[PDB]
């Protein structure tokens, strides 16, 4: 498109936002530059009116997708640049799960040589004690609380594993030892932990032999697994999530095997064992949700009725208590001008945002670096 010529260099950016969230009025001004050749944005935003009444992370998506890097084989699908310099109107509804909603209307267009994004934001139905108005979101932390749920699951698993280790040793030292989980008759955790399936899962010896250092009491692996699940729950990185997921998958396989041993080999309804299986299913589901979460591609489709595009996507904001706050985004873009625009095939934008602080800035502010690449259409 002709608009493309406006983005091959470095372009100055002005962002102006007037907002009202549950009657708390505020204004933001941002300035910086966009480098669409590298899909890169660098901006600093200031709350001009005082303290921002919502967390800065919740405004990132509202505060110029014309600066996305569209690979060359996708140049025909870049609506945003094709609508320039005349610009486009961008409207969103952002639904914060179990909380309020933002509605935004922005005009994005060139004024002289500056790409200007002017935005009106209305927020309603937010909870004063919630994560948004209550300022409970992490700004950019790389480590934090694991959350009450993960903590309960992992400490319970760890405590049970430690007790199983203790039980195995005590029963090895006294045939008449009775554990708290020795309920009687057909329920003896002592017998379970003392069986060959209680060491190396009854499998290690058959691959690594019985001498191996990996042929440890199951509860040792349990201690390690629950401790690492909790510690990885303190990390805010993709790789910690993938590790949690893979280890949960292993724990799933092992739990099903051990349950089979319980019911068809040992004939023992081991309540503490079943409890660890339930904890393992819980952690499996948590790591599954985690891996899903925060991928956050912006899914774009053409809206021929408005000569524009629509998009939808999910943002996950880390909460200081270790939980996550979903922000479900619905988006529409319509050209301001009457000249031709590109209507794309289905695709998505992959976005990475880095939030930081200006050590010399005393006003409430956010420094933002952003990298966005178009994808979702195979180059073949
Ligand atoms: O101890 C046991 O003896 C048995 C002998 C016969 C039949 C059943 C069992 C039994 O049900 C287990 C489970 C094994 C569990 C555990 C949980 C997770 C992992 C683990 C997960 C992922 C990765 Br990666 C590595 C290890 C290992 C063990 C730890 C544990 C702790 C207390 C009580 C029971 C158990
Ligand atoms: C050996 C039986 C194994 C039979 C298999 C499944 C159900 C068994 C339930 C066995 C009793 C556990 C119930 C319990 O949780 O606490 C004990 C009390 O009897 C409260 O019913």
Of all protein residues, whose CA lies closest to atom 17 belonging to ligand 2? 183
Instruction: Please work out whether the CB of residue 187 comes within 6 Å of at least one atom of ligand 2.
Output: yes
CB 223 within 8 A of CB 251: no
d(CA 294, CA 212) in angstroms, rounded, equals 40
Strand duo 114-124 + 11-21: pairing: parallel
Within 8 A by CB and 6+ apart from 33, the residues are 10, 11, 12, 13, 41, 42, 43
Q: Which two tokens stand for residue 281?
A: 């299913």
CB 347 within 8 A of CB 74: yes
> Which residues approach ligand 1 with their CB closer than 6 A?
160-161, 164, 192-193, 195, 197-198, 218-219, 221-222, 225, 247, 250-251, 254, 258, 261-262, 272-273, 276
In terms of CATH architecture, what is 149-293? Up-down Bundle (1.20)
Residue 221 CA: nearest ligand 1 atom is 26
Of all protein residues, whose CA lies closest to atom 19 belonging to ligand 1? 222
CA atoms within 13 A on the CB side of 150: 27
Spacing of C-alpha 330 from chain mean position: 18
CA-derived radius of gyration, the chain: 27
User: For residue 273, how far is its CA from the centre of ligand 1 (angstroms)?
Assistant: 7
CB 55 within 8 A of CB 135: yes
CB 308 within 8 A of CB 341: yes
Which stretches within the chain are classed as H helix? 79-82, 148-173, 189-194, 205-208, 218-233, 238-261, 271-292
Question: For the CA atoms of 69, 71, 76, 78, what is the dihedral angle to 10 degrees?
Answer: -10
CB 239 within 8 A of CB 174: no
Within 8 A by CB and 6+ apart from 82, the residues are 1, 3, 4, 340, 341, 342
CA atoms within 13 A on the CB side of 72: 0
User: For residue 167, how far is its CA from the centre of ligand 1 (angstroms)?
Assistant: 14
């Amino acid at each position: 498109s002709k608009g493309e010529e406006l983005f091959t260099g470095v372009v100055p950016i002005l962002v102006e936002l007037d907002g009202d969230v549950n009657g708390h009025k505020f204004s933001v001004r941002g300035e910086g530059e966009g480098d669409a050749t590298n899909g890169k944005l660098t901006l600093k935003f200031i709350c001009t009116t005082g303290k921002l009444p919502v967390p800065w992370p919740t405004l990132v998506t509202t505060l110029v997708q014309c600066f996305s890097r569209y690979p060359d084989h996708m140049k025909r699908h870049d609506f945003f640049k094709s609508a320039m310099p005349e610009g486009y109107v961008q409207e969103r509804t952002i639904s914060f799960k179990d909380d309020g909603t933002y509605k935004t209307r922005a005009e994005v267009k060139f004024e002289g040589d500056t790409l200007v994004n002017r935005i009106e934001l209305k927020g309603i139905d937010f909870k004063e004690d919630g994560n948004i108005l209550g300022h409970k979101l992490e700004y950019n932390s790389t480590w934090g609380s694991p959350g009450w749920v993960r903590l309960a699951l992992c400490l319970t698993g760890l405590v049970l594993s430690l007790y199983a280790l203790h039980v195995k040793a005590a029963r090895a030292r006294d045939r008449d030892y009775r554990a708290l989980c020795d309920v009687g008759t057909a329920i003896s955790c002592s017998r379970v932990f003392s069986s060959r399936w209680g060491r190396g899962f009854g499998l290690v010896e058959h691959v690594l032999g019985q001498d191996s250092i990996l042929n440890q009491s199951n509860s040792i692996f349990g201690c390690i697994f629950y401790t690492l699940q909790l510690l990885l729950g303190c990390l805010r990185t993709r790789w910690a999530s993938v590790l949690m997921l893979l280890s949960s998958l292993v724990s799933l396989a092992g739990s099903v095997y051990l349950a089979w041993i319980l019911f068809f080999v040992l004939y023992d309804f081991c309540i503490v064992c079943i409890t660890t299986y339930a904890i393992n299913v819980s952690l499996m589901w948590l790591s599954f949700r985690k891996v899903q979460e925060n991928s956050h591609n912006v899914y774009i489709t053409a809206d021929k009725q408005k000569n524009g595009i629509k998009a939808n996507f999910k943002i996950r904001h880390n909460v200081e208590d270790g939980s996550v706050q979903l922000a479900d985004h619905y988006q529409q873009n319509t050209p301001i001008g009457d000249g031709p625009v590109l209507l794309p095939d289905n695709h998505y934008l992959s976005t990475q945002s880095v939030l930081s602080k200006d050590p010399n800035e005393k006003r409430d502010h956010m420094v933002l670096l952003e990298f966005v690449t178009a994808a979702g259409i195979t180059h073949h």
